[PDB]
Symmetry: C3
Subunit: 434 residues, 3 copies
Amino acid sequence: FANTSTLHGIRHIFVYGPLTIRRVLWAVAFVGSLGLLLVESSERVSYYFSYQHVTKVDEVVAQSLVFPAVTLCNLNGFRFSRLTTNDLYHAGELLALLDVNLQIPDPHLADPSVLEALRQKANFKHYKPKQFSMLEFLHRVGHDLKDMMLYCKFKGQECGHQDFTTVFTKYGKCYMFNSGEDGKPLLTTVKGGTGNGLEIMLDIQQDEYLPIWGETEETTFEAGVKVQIHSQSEPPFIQELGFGVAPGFQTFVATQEQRLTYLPPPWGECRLDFFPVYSITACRIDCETRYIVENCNCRMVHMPGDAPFCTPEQHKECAEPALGLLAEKDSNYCLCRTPCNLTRYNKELSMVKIPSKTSAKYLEKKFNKSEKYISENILVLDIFFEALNYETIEQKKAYEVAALLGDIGGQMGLFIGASILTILELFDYIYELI
Amino acid sequence: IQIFANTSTLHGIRHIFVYGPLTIRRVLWAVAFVGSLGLLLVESSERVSYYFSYQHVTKVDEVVAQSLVFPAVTLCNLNGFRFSRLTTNDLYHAGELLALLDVNLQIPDPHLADPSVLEALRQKANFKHYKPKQFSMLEFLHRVGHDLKDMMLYCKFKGQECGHQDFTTVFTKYGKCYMFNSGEDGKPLLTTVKGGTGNGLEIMLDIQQDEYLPIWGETEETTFEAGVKVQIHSQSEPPFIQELGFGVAPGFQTFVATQEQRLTYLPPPWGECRDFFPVYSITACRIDCETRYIVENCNCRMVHMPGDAPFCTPEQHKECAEPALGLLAELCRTPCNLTRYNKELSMVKIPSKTSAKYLEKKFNKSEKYISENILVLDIFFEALNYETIEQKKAYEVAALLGDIGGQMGLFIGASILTILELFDYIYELI
Amino acid sequence: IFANTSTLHGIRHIFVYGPLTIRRVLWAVAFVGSLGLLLVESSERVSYYFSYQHVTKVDEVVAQSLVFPAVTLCNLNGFRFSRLTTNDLYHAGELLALLDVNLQIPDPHLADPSVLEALRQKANFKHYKPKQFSMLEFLHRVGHDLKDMMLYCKFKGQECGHQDFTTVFTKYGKCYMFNSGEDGKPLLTTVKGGTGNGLEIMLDIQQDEYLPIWGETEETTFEAGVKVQIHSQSEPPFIQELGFGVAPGFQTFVATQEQRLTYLPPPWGECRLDFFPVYSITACRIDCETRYIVENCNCRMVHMPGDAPFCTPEQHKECAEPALGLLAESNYCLCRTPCNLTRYNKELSMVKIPSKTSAKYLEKKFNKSEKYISENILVLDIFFEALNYETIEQKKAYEVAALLGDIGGQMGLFIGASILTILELFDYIYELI
């Protein structure tokens, strides 16, 4: 009888009278309903714990964008003219100007003019060496922006090498525009188009490039600059993320601000010894640095730390094969996950010829250079925003707990009419039968 | 006086054994219910809070098509005025503008000029006893601006021949430009039906680099560059090549592999989408905006602007409208439907060795000229499909109900009516 | 034997049945009202469910290695002039546009002197007995040779060779595909970003083997370089359409990202082959071309698969070329997206080759003029910008379990009804009859 009596209950049961009946279908109809509720409620919980996301892509008109950092590097790291005898001593083998015995490799195939200058400076049989510092070396021999930069406009106003910042990188002594160093307030763009961005004309000084001759294992046949457009929060990794600019063209880099937002685990993979602010580039440098200061007790020039600078002795026989080993052989010493908030810059590249006929003469005059030189050494580079807007890409949580309840809640309502309390009511009644 | 005690409402739909007459260890129900009620209020708030946050999410498809509508291609020589075709009257008014003449109407630094250039400017600039004649910046530009008839050596579309009669004059901050497949004259828009370089627009251009205005001596100008600018753009939008154009260089076949993008944005409260032009565009408004500010503060309009205003004379251009724009830059939101075109650029060299001679012959031009003046330009669809990017409303009212509905079901077993039932019963107690 | 008044056992929410009529008939409206909305809103939800929407899930994933794609590359020139034989000029002569319909040099007075000399040497058919000719054997022999064309190949810093590429015929002629996977060895992988650790090849395009053009030809073949498709090893190259140009006199950098698209079948999306085991849009579009030509032309072209017979230049001209011309204009061919697939997104940048200080080295090493080097040599770097793939998935918007939870909660809200509540009522109406 008690069962008959518990049918003031909230779950839905005509399965308890005094006499057995016609209506045993309710037994099935209820067991049926209960079945589905359990099937479908599982799915919803299963899915909830799958901790999915979905993507929200907007594009937002803006009154101004913050102009990014532009790092740029000559493909040539060391000017030939500026190599000293002391330099050719330590760095000689490194720059591939000298064989292991400190002597000019295949003298008969060398440029006459090159061999003249190397014979003058590389007589090491009797040489008493002097102290040498890879950083001091690079600072002195690396291409000079003062020399390289023929003009600089930003938003149509004049600029100069005083708006750039020396920044060492696997390419040597490089220059970063709008770096923000010394907390100077970052430059901003206020109009789209080629006109109102960064515009620089460069002489890449192609006749200071290290010479290549004879039976060399070298393939450094290329001339121009590498360039990374990158947010001021992240260091340049121009090694990998650079794009080429070629001489004899005005290259247009039309850019858009991208504002990524990622979710932490368990939805996504969101979330440093040497850098205050975290970056993928930042970690991957910090990682490189830590593994070399460990296995080589020096650091390279582009790395941070207070460690001692890797001598060309070390660079050759230690640190270069150490990186050779880091990538291909040894799983990441540090694998580096995405930051949560971050800003990317999307580039479209187009080009027009420089110089035109009607300017060729002017340029030859102004700069005291041959028609040839201008046409194999000069480029113009425009970085600029296509229009005043950023794109937002956010990862949004797919199914939060409140929505799970509303779904299991409505599913219960549909099949049984049950609440939490309905179940409690039943458990109370079974605990009373014991 | 004759109404049910609380005890008596066990007819009530909420889930309550809190009204047996004498007190019991089962005060937990009071907790369990107040507990359940608490969460219901917490969780139902969240859902309403969220609803009114009027979020969206994004739906990205890519759709195979039997045919795409081919876009509008506007193209401009980097040079706005051919030197050969400058007249003495032109050099009079426009002289200072083109930076061929100082504030007085004479050649700035004749000693540094090309010999041949100075000869030709002396021939045409004798102004001490010249009585000026009528001058019109539009008529000027129409006449001196590069001619497509001259510039265009061949035109294919879908492999079939084309001509300057498939293009339309269009003035822009670059001068007299030309727009392919413009749709003007209500002619039915060209369509592509096969991918690849072959079956798009293909044009060979001579940019006439030796008609470029010369620059010499102690000039502040830096127009050192040669080639064309190009905007690929939907026929409903005007070109804004000043900002959105991409460069093409001479001495290369430049390939522009394109995809149709079909953006759909939501109005407020979810997203931010919503007179001189029939159709609204961001470019359209930004022109309308520039025009209104210049016709106000300068009583003229420039050549590329619309309106019925009077064309800005070089007098005005110098002293008024140029610094007016200098002042202007120093809120136009997205249309709801719109079509974008995504470009990938690649290049090959022109001319090849085995055709260099042929081209020199056919066009009566130097080996040098061909190599510093000729380009080929292919605009074409990579394959027959458009990408759709739609903003979809995140949480509609029907789904809010289903969630607050099921939350009530879960914690209380309440309906709307359940609450009404309770309010009826309290109104009866008063 | 149950009373309307007496169904107070009923689960939907009803104060509407006493014995006498009352001021509280509002319940009748409030209920009919509630029932109204329930029907309005529950329709919307079902309507929407059957609208079978989706939404998009975009992640980006760090990886310790990416699989390097397939690179197919083609010289713009399909046939080296030097290597054209007398037999070849006989059958293929008209095809290569070297000879008019009467097997004679078209406008000899406008021809390059040196060209005409070499065509006269090879195209005097006065006494010639023709021999067996095969467009495939022809193309295999005359088409540019990678051995010749490829001056060096690096991958991940280590050396490479023509034996890491695979001959692959295409609308452009005899082309070469890197990391094709055909050798049943495991596909090559990148483990560091940047220019250095991708494919890097230096090519001499042999611009002076290009077929010459002279006199009154209707032509656009003025251009020199290579076309290149970066593509999934699962898909054949369709370089005719999907290729990008590389120009001589530049190191061209192709920075790529792996994209991993997932699409939904009907009814949500348009997801999901005689001649190809693996399905591709490219794959079916070839299979489609092939089927239509073997039907309407009884041959196949060289790039097509099948067991059909190869189209002779006779056939190629007068049959199969206009047959494809007729496929254009407007598709007799429906080729939908695969479900899983991998795309490669390319950014192109360039620097000059050669530098001044290497120009002479290259001239010497390769025994070539300053001019030749500068109009024939290019370097091509394909590589991943950084170790990650982008995932774009189409995700079902509203599955059946979520429809129930919504119709369920809507019923709960307006009526307090379950499935059983309605059954309960139908039982009670079947009992009234």
